[PDB]
Design a protein around this nucleic acid. Sequence first.
DNA 1: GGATGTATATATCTGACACGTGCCTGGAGACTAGGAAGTAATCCCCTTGGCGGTTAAAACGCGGGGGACAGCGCGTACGTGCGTTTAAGCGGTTGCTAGAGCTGTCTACGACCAATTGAGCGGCCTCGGCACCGGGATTCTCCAGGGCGGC
Length: 49
Amino acid sequence: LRVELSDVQTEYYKNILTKNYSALTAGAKGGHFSLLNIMNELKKASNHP
DNA sequence: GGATGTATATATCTGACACGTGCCTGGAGACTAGGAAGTAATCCCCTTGGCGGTTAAAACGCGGGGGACAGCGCGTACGTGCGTTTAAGCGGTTGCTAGAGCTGTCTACGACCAATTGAGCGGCCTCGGCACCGGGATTCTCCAGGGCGGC
């Protein structure tokens, strides 16, 4: 069963895939968003925001 | 009526601005070579999120006593003040020598380049020593026969 993505999932996928440290850090002062293992973060974004 | 306090004017001292000059060091223009940026390939280490099992370290609680801290006494050693001494600080002599600066000459020593080759790095074969397996020598436990006692 292939399901489409929500808007939050789509913007998280676009922020990770086109790396946006400033945009990913924005919101409750970040917390040192680690973009090492890009595919791990993409799988996390595909699962749940 | 005489001398004192105060205001304005003039000469002199002093830091700062501009003018002048040398010179030498930085800037402009041109040329060239190589340092570094970029590209592709290969291979190994690091990242993130998990699982499993061992186990020794970490955590928690509790009793107790050793040590930190406060207080007090005391005596000594350091602060304080004064009078006396002494040596630092300044100015000075008198010559000679060391050293910075500048100029000049020259020569041995180090940069540079080409050819060479032999010392450093990797793998391969062998020995020294440690270990695995087979055989000989030495000592320990055991089963059976002979003799004696009882009904």
